[PDB]
Point group: D4
Chain length 160, copies 8
């Protein structure tokens, strides 16, 4: 029914990356919303979004951005909810700028940061799932199945 | 008073950093355990710790390591719980080796990674608190009070005197 | 004597760096204000400071921050004024995290970024002065005199004695 | 009429990047000149250009270069005008060489530095606009409109 | 007959790199096994593999992985055999993450690390060969021939 | 008691690092020699050392160097023996120049590279030991005992007192 | 007639880069030889080449290599002649490994290092030319002409 | 005794590094001059110094600078002489900014670049000596003697005592 995870990203160009988070949440049947919120171009949209997230029923926010990537950290500044950050791969610096601007948060306002790129987007959704599983037993069983299938499906030898 | 968070680290030299996570959980009245588990010197200890964490009642694991920092990632391989990683600052490469070896987990096994050093340890505890707050209303109120106080405590101007 | 430049920083620990901007504006007789505004601990304070800056008569904002340094960029998001950013040197990564998180603004919202540390703070004040000089002839003459003196003051040879 | 911003770049290969600065100034109707000036191959051209910029009526210089990128800093050495620097993306090091050789100016001679690549070129033009807006009210209103349109135009959700 | 070197890699995507190790061992007629073992997705498979390697008759393990690359180091944690590590080139960070997560092992558990990418995979196989040559004289002669041919085959001038 | 491992380094300043390899080989009762060989100042000494190593009875070479660190790679060019490289930490670039100039050998001439600094020197000796253990059963038993003791010696919890 | 500059490179794959040095020397009519010499695969060829260079009449050596790039430094170890180093762009690390392994020579054995890639190869040839011009007046005049033409040929404005 | 090499640097703070070039030229009896020329604070001084160097009888220029290090490159823009660049170590970025801003000259205007710091300064003087030796037989013999002595002076083993 109502969303319990919010996926937000700074622009349409981030979607090629953040779609992997959206797909994973859908696979695990976690109700969620998927939105564009720009820290730099729509800062008041971000303030309102982050400030009202908990009262709207959201439990986790997944935020993706690239370059001087401020969206996850500023989201965390306005909410007590856990915020997970996805560094989007940038053209010149390959997401090293994205990674350092997200992960290096000063003490007092955390962002749980995942890998650069599609791997990070997928893992932010899995981390959000593991958080919700702590108090949602049906989901916890679906997550167990997901992790079991991942493990069991790894081949024993490479194909030529 | 059974532990609901586990703080683990590879060596005593990590404690100077990880003590900041311990202090913050205690401040917020979150029961927890603090242990040494070496990914490289005690790999079977790690396997056992991680695979039994959920049945022992743990809800979050905070793992710190430096250099080729494998403890958070291998912990996450064996548990379904959320694992949070603290890159401990290293001597030569200033924690850049720690950071990359923790945060760059391939898709499928997450570690939620915090800043290099003491800031990251403090933030791993706050992030764990924000997770537990989702289903613990008393802790949720303590955390809001804590965040509100942090905000109200920021000075308006610097002390500019010579 | 109303302020025409605003110097802002996230914490008292930034003052050791940002004091160099303050000193240079005073030397050039540019009225200014100096404040602590934390992007992460006081985000509503930042929104209010930045959105009202122009109507309060400010012409330039100089913002310093370190680590995941978001203060200059978020200030620029809310003001139409020019924002100049000073990367404060950080402990582990020597200001490389500060530099990249300030200078790499996506197209649409600029921050004019200066060098890591004290040199950058001094240069943010000089750059602000060069901006204001475009429409303040008395300050323009003070700035030319200052630049001329800097040039004339460079020694011709090093002191080479043992 | 007469130019009030000068866009200079070290070579024709920089134009793919610096054209974004030229386009933005034209969009905001800021009269400007767009020139090739090489710090390394035409150093006397650079000295003359920078030394006479103010007396020619220029108010801001935008300078782009790549690699060991000296054009912005040497321009600033010869003028009291504000100089804004655009690090052009280099082939091997992806503009990290460009960025460090522009931004790390010693105290006493500033260059306001923007992002590596096309984003930086666009933002140098916007920063030049915000500088001129301080004493040109018609332009200040056009810049307000530009920033308002940027903010209002951000979509609320990504397209698949 | 029975394998004396084990080549292991974290996923099928590593094979484009690790095939160069497999080819070299085959060229030198060193019996070996070539397997997928994931540190993160199949950690119990890894524990069993590394713990039993010596008793199965393996003498050297070559382990390849990318990103947060833990496979070589965790393999070394469970075996007294020499473990050689190949950093696989990652998409964003070009194997710098792979290299630092493999080479920077703390004192007490070594991994002999080779270059990022195909060069490293080839050299891990050559290093494994030089190790086995110490107590296998027929192989030592084949390795001498291999190195002699490499040296003799280098042209004296480039082709246009 | 003839040497079966050769430890070589470019200068006396490398000894503070390479002494950790020497100590570990002695602990495990592995006879060895320790020498200064400069790739850049004594290139003919290096050629002779490396090309005669196998006929002199050496089985493994451990080579340390810093900066533009060419000693391990050029040693490997002249010997068929396994060569293990230790990146010595450098002043400005913290051993990153040492690391890249040793580990990034093009295909055809291997150097097995260990961590920057003292950890790498210790691990080069342990790796050499694991190589020799493959055909020396007494040493194999000493090495297993050593690794077992390392594992059993890891404490279960940190010393957390103030 | 007889060569006065030697261009050497570690492999055929370096030629795409080092051909720019060869072309420049030919343009300035500087007699030279262009050879493959591998530090790692033909170390005795390198020793002989560098040791006999001066007595063969060579005045400058230009040496190019990539990755763990040892060719320039080891050449300098065996000759009193000036050795100029060209870092060849490597696949993963984009010549940062090449650059640091060439430029960071300890005191006592120098290598004059140029930029990563084709720019460096061209500039090594120009630097070799400026060295020879010091005692060859006809060449000094040709180099003056070359530099004058470079300066005069820079356009004043970019082409669209 | 007219100078045939010019050593130039941007500030007195560079002398701690550039003094190593001065000492080595004096040791090899190469007459030279040592001056401060700031690319950014005295750009016309630099233009004049560089464009007149050859007619004044200089054969090689050794230029040191740190940070955004433009002095060697701009010197080379104005002279046809060989210019050798010394990256002076910087506080935050350890000379990596100095190194990249000197070595990465686009094709057409060379700077022969040496190592970061004192080693680079010493090697710039040795490289200048090797250039001048090509047409100065007495200096050629002094340089060979110097290189031979360096080689013969390398010890055969480290001092390994505790």
């Amino acid at each position: 029914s109502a969303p319990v995870v919010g996926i937000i990203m700074g622009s349409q160009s981030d979607w090629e990356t953040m779609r992997h988070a959206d797909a994973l949440l859908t696979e695990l049947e976690i109700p969620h919303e998927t939105l564009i919120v720009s820290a730099h171009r729509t800062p008041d949209r971000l303030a309102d979004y982050a400030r009202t997230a908990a009262e709207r029923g959201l439990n986790v926010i997944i935020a993706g951005a690239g370059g001087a990537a401020h969206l996850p950290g500023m989201c965390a500044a306005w909410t007590r909810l856990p915020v997970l950050g996805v560094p989007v791969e940038s053209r010149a610096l390959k997401g090293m700028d994205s990674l350092l601007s997200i992960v290096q948060m000063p003490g007092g306002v955390p962002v749980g940061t995942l890998a650069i790129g599609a791997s990070g987007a997928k893992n932010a959704a899995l981390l959000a799932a593991s958080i919700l599983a702590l108090f949602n037993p049906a989901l916890a069983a679906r997550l167990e199945t997901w992790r079991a299938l991942q493990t069991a499906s790894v081949p024993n030898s490479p194909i030529t």
